[PDB]
Amino acid sequence: EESISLTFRNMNDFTPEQVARQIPRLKAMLAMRSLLRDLKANLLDNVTFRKELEKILRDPALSQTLRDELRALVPEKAW
Ligand SMILES: [Cl-]
Ligand SMILES: [Zn+2]
């Protein structure tokens, strides 16, 4: 799926501090999903995969907890 959704379950979710955490997180998740699909469909080699991965996870607005969950999705043979 080429798409992702930010769901607001209350009005307090629209707070600029909440939007600023949620937008880069969802962007990293969608970029990661596309990159893993590219790798699994053999559309890019391991060297390109690792270069793109580092770009995705470089976003300073991401939590290290999220980066860890994203890196845990990488198949062992792509390292
Ligand atoms: Cl999470
Ligand atoms: Zn989690």
CB-CB contact of 28 with 59 (8 Å): yes
The answer to whether the CB of 73 falls within 8 A of the CB of 36 is yes
H/E/C letters for each residue in 8-55? CCCHHHHCHHHHHHHHHHHHHHHHHHHHHHHHHCCCCCHHHHHHHHHH
Give the span between the Cα atoms of 46 and 19, in whole angstroms.
33
Gap from CA of 72 to ligand 1 centroid (Å): 12
Technique that determined the structure: X-ray
Asked if residues 75 and 39 have their Cβ atoms less than 8 Å apart, the reply is yes
Q: Which ligand is nearest to the CA of 62?
A: 1
Distance CA 28, CA 66 (A): 9
Three-state secondary-structure class, residue 57:
helix
Task: Tell me the structure's resolution in angstroms, rounded to a single decimal.
Answer: 2.0
Cα 77 from Cα 79, distance rounded (Å) = 6
Token couple for 27: 């962007």
Alpha carbon of residue 55 to chain centroid: 10
Length of the chain: 79
Q: Which residues are annotated as a binding site?
A: 69
